[PDB]
Enzyme design. Structure first.
Site, short mmCIF file in Angstrom:
data_model
loop_
_atom_site.label_atom_id
_atom_site.label_comp_id
_atom_site.label_asym_id
_atom_site.label_seq_id
_atom_site.Cartn_x
_atom_site.Cartn_y
_atom_site.Cartn_z
N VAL A 18 0.88 -1.15 0.00
CA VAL A 18 0.00 0.00 0.00
C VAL A 18 0.92 1.20 0.00
CG1 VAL A 18 -1.79 1.27 1.22
CG2 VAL A 18 -1.81 -1.23 1.23
N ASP A 118 -12.51 -10.60 8.66
CA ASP A 118 -11.17 -10.45 9.21
C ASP A 118 -11.01 -9.18 10.00
OD1 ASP A 118 -7.68 -10.68 8.00
OD2 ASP A 118 -8.61 -11.54 9.82
C1 582 Z 1 -0.54 -0.16 5.38
C2 582 Z 1 -1.93 -0.13 6.02
N1 582 Z 1 -2.52 1.23 5.75
C3 582 Z 1 -3.50 1.19 4.76
O1 582 Z 1 -3.84 0.18 4.17
C4 582 Z 1 -4.24 2.41 4.41
C5 582 Z 1 -5.32 2.68 3.49
C6 582 Z 1 -6.03 1.71 2.57
N2 582 Z 1 -5.64 4.01 3.63
N3 582 Z 1 -4.86 4.58 4.52
C7 582 Z 1 -3.93 3.58 5.01
C8 582 Z 1 -2.83 3.66 5.99
C9 582 Z 1 -2.50 4.88 6.59
C10 582 Z 1 -1.46 4.94 7.57
C11 582 Z 1 -0.75 3.76 7.97
C12 582 Z 1 -1.11 2.48 7.40
C13 582 Z 1 -2.15 2.43 6.39
#
Ligand code: 582
Length: 268
Positions: A18, A118
């Site tokens: 991501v 989940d």
């Molecule tokens: C890595 C996990 N993660 C996401 O998957 C995600 C999404 C979709 N929107 N914002 C985030 C996000 C924002 C800050 C930290 C982890 C995050």
């Protein structure tokens, strides 16, 4: 019209992967889930049905050969997981507010016949104002279609969060499974520890809970009011387990605890 508006710079790894993407022109931020197809179809299909304030917004997806790009709402507050202090949890009023938001998201999903499967702190993100958003529909599925419920049988989820019926029965109702994992999330929030590795009688901690030994660990750290709610959620028989409309009537659920976000003020 505006020339470069479709260009996004990938600025940082959020957690395939991501990426945090920032628009070249507007500086708007979005999360881009990059999946190397070499489940996705279902995940995109499910995301297109979703529109709720406690569910990570889906903006669209783009092909690009074998790589799939899912554009999702960026949640600057990060994972709920990171707000839980080990062995302690977090202030009760904060846990209650996140729990209210979590129930709002879940009611919404169940209302449209979707089960997440989940739910856990890693999949519950927070926006700039600490609003909780349910994320990752990779394991999600339709449990109700044309008003007919379909029983589930696929074993999915994460052991410490999974309901005991998924380990003991061939088929099971979707909704009580999501309720159970919400109960485990509430426990984590209030105690900063998970009660068992898995909900099996072979698990000493799990048998202890069924024997009501609440003078033990994570239970002794709670408070009687939220603990009474947990006693209703973490019930082995999913047919006897509390439903969401009844959780919304719970005493702790309705207890005034938390002031709203503090706004600027002065005195004369
Ligand atoms: C890595 C996990 N993660 C996401 O998957 C995600 C999404 C979709 N929107 N914002 C985030 C996000 C924002 C800050 C930290 C982890 C995050």
């Amino acid at each position: 019209a505006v020339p470069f508006v479709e260009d996004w710079d990938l600025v940082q790894t959020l957690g395939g992967e991501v990426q945090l993407a920032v628009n070249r022109v507007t500086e708007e931020a979005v999360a881009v889930k990059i999946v190397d197809m070499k489940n996705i179809k279902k995940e995109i299909c499910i995301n297109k049905m979703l529109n709720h304030e406690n569910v990570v917004k889906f903006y669209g997806h783009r092909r690009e050969g074998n790589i799939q790009y899912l554009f999702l709402e960026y949640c600057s507050g990060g994972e709920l997981f990171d707000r839980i202090e080990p062995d302690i949890g977090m202030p009760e009023p904060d846990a209650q507010r996140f729990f209210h938001q979590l129930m709002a998201g879940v009611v919404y999903l169940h209302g449209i016949g979707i089960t997440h499967r989940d739910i856990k702190p890693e999949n519950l993100l927070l926006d700039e104002r600490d609003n909780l958003k349910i994320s990752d529909f990779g394991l999600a599925t339709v449990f109700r279609y044309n008003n007919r419920e379909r029983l589930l049988n696929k074993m999915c989820g994460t052991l410490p969060y999974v309901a005991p019926e998924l380990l003991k029965r061939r088929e099971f109702h979707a909704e009580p499974v999501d309720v159970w994992s919400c109960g485990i999330v509430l426990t984590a929030m209030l105690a900063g520890e998970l009660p068992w590795d898995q909900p099996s009688d072979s698990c000493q901690e799990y048998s202890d809970w069924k024997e009501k030994k609440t003078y033990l660990n994570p239970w002794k750290k709670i408070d009687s009011a939220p603990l009474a709610l947990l006693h209703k959620i973490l019930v082995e028989n999913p047919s006897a387990r509390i439903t969401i409309p009844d959780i919304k009537k719970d005493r702790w659920y309705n207890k005034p605890l938390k002031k709203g976000a503090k706004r600027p003020r002065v005195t004369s």
